C-alpha cells in the first residue's frame, strides 16, 4: 500500500497561469479520494461523471491533473457547457467529461501588496479553442485588415493581459486556485485503484 502524491499538487507554492495550465500525469498508485472530499478548505468541489461518494471503487487506466489560477468571478466558466471567454480562449473542457473540479480561494498567498505581474491571461485569438489544446506561443495579433509588421500601434495588439490581483478588492476579484482532475479508462490494465 503506497499512497499517491496528491500533496505535491494541491500544496504547490505557486500555480501556473491560466493560458499555460500545468498538466500532470498520475499512474501506478492507490489514490486516496477520502481526503480530497472531506477537506474543509475548498469552496467548490464538483464532480460530473461520477458522484464523489463512490470514487473508492472505480479503477481508471490513467488520470491527469490540470492546475492553474483564475479570477474569483470567472470560476463559473469551468464546466462542459457554460461557455464564455476563459473557457473559450484558454482552457476548454470536453463535452463528455468524466472528472472533477476543485477550486478554492487563496487570497493571502497569490496576491502581493503593491500589485502582482506573474499572472497573465490570453485575449484576442483567431478562433475558439478545441478541447484541451494548449497554446503557449505568443505572436503579435491583428485587429482588422492591417499588415502586421511586428508593429502593435492600433494595427496588432499584444494578446496577453496582466491580472492586477490587488489585496484589497472585493471577493469577486481575488485569485482562486483551480485543479481539474480528468479520469481515463483507456484499454489497458487498471493502473490505479482506491483501497
Amino acid at each position, epitope marked *: 500500500t503506497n499512497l499517491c502524491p496528491f500533496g*505535491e499538487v494541491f500544496n504547490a507554492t505557486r500555480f*501556473a497561469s491560466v493560458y499555460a495550465w500545468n498538466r500532470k500525469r498520475i499512474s501506478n498508485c492507490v489514490a486516496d479520494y477520502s481526503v480530497l472530499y472531506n477537506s474543509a478548505s475548498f469552496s467548490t468541489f464538483k464532480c460530473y461523471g461520477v458522484s464523489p461518494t463512490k470514487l473508492n471503487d472505480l479503477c481508471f487506466t490513467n488520470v491527469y491533473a490540470d492546475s492553474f489560477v483564475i479570477r474569483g468571478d470567472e470560476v463559473r466558466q469551468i464546466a462542459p457547457g457554460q461557455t464564455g471567454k476563459i473557457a473559450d480562449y484558454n482552457y476548454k473542457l470536453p463535452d463528455d467529461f468524466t472528472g472533477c473540479v476543485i477550486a478554492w480561494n487563496s487570497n493571502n498567498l497569490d496576491s502581493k501588496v503593491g500589485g502582482n505581474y*506573474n499572472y497573465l491571461y490570453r485575449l484576442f485569438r483567431k478562433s475558439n479553442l478545441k478541447p484541451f489544446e494548449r497554446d503557449i506561443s505568443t505572436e503579435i495579433y491583428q485587429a482588422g485588415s492591417t499588415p502586421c509588421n511586428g508593429v502593435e500601434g492600433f494595427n496588432c495588439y499584444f494578446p496577453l493581459q496582466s491580472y492586477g490581483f490587488q489585496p484589497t478588492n472585493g471577493v469577486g476579484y481575488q485569485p482562486y486556485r483551480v485543479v481539474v482532475l480528468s479520469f481515463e479508462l483507456l484499454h489497458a490494465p487498471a493502473t490505479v485503484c482506491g483501497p
Partner: antibody, heavy 127, light 113 residues
Framework: QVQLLESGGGLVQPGRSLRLSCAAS????????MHWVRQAPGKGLEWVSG????????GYADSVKGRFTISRDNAKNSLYLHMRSLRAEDTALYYC????????????????????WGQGTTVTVSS | DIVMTQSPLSLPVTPGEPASISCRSS???????????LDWYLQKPGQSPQLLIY???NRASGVPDRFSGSGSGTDFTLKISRVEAEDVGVYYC?????????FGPGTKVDIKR
C-alpha cells in the same frame, strides 16, 4: 553529470532587449527552484531573480523591478530571462544556480542553497 | 528590504590558525519552524562561487568537516578550525526569509605575512 549552460551575451546599446537562456542537463529539471544571480565587474554578487518548482516566480531585486521578466519551461529543460530597457549600469556576469532541497522532502517549500553554478556570460552595454 | 553587515571587513589569516567571521541582520530570521534561513557562500579567486553552509549550521554536502557555523537571532558566525593554503577568497552571507534575498558586502580572506 549536472551541467548548467547559459547563452545570450554580447554588446548591446542602451535601450534595447536581450534574452538570456540557461539549459540544465543531468537531473529532474522541474524538481529544483532555479535562480538568476548577477555579478558586477570586480564587485560582490547580487541576487536578480528566481523561479520555484511550479513555474511561479518569487520576485525580483528592488532596483531592477519593472523591466526583467523570467520564464521557465520544464518540457525543454530551459529557463529564460527577457531583459528590456537597459541602462549602462546592467553590465555584469550572470550565473544560473540551482536549489538543494527536493520539493516535499523536509514547513514551507525550499528556496535556499544555490549549490551548482554554471560559468556565466559577459553581458555588456555601451555606445 | 533587509540589509546585512559582516565583520571584520577584511582579515588576514595564516595557515594553521582558526578563523571567525560574523554576519549580522536587521530582522531576526527565526521562522515559525524554528530554523534560521541564513546561508554561507564562498568564492575562490577566478572561479564561480560555491556553497558552504545552508540552514544556519546544517553543513553542506561535499565540503570537509573543518568549517563550523553557529549563532541565531540576528547574529551568526562561521569558524574555520584549521585554515590552510586553499582557503583564500571572498565570503558572503545570504538571507532566505523575506524576498528579495540579499548578499553581504563580503569578507576578503588572504594570507598574512
Amino acid at each position: 553529470q549536472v551541467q548548467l549552460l547559459e547563452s545570450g551575451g554580447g554588446l548591446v546599446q542602451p535601450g534595447r532587449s536581450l534574452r538570456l537562456s540557461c539549459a540544465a542537463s543531468g537531473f529532474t529539471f522541474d524538481d529544483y527552484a532555479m535562480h538568476w544571480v548577477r555579478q558586477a565587474p570586480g564587485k560582490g554578487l547580487e541576487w536578480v531573480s528566481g523561479v520555484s518548482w511550479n513555474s511561479g516566480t518569487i520576485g525580483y531585486a528592488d532596483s531592477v523591478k519593472g523591466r526583467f521578466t523570467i520564464s521557465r519551461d520544464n518540457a525543454k529543460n530551459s529557463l529564460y530571462l527577457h531583459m528590456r530597457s537597459l541602462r549602462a549600469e546592467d553590465t555584469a556576469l550572470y550565473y544560473c544556480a540551482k536549489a538543494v532541497e527536493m520539493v516535499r522532502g523536509l514547513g514551507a517549500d525550499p528556496e535556499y542553497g544555490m549549490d551548482v553554478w554554471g560559468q556565466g556570460t559577459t553581458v555588456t552595454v555601451s555606445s | 528590504d533587509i540589509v546585512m553587515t559582516q565583520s571584520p571587513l577584511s582579515l588576514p589569516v595564516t595557515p594553521g590558525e582558526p578563523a571567525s567571521i560574523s554576519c549580522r541582520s536587521s530582522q531576526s530570521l527565526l521562522h515559525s519552524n524554528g530554523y534560521n534561513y541564513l546561508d554561507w557562500y564562498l568564492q575562490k579567486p577566478g572561479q564561480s562561487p560555491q556553497l558552504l553552509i545552508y540552514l544556519g549550521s546544517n553543513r553542506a554536502s561535499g565540503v570537509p568537516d573543518r568549517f563550523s557555523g553557529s549563532g541565531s537571532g540576528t547574529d551568526f558566525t562561521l569558524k574555520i578550525s584549521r585554515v590552510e593554503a586553499e582557503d583564500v577568497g571572498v565570503y558572503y552571507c545570504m538571507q532566505a526569509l523575506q524576498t528579495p534575498f540579499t548578499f553581504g558586502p563580503g569578507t576578503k580572506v588572504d594570507i598574512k605575512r
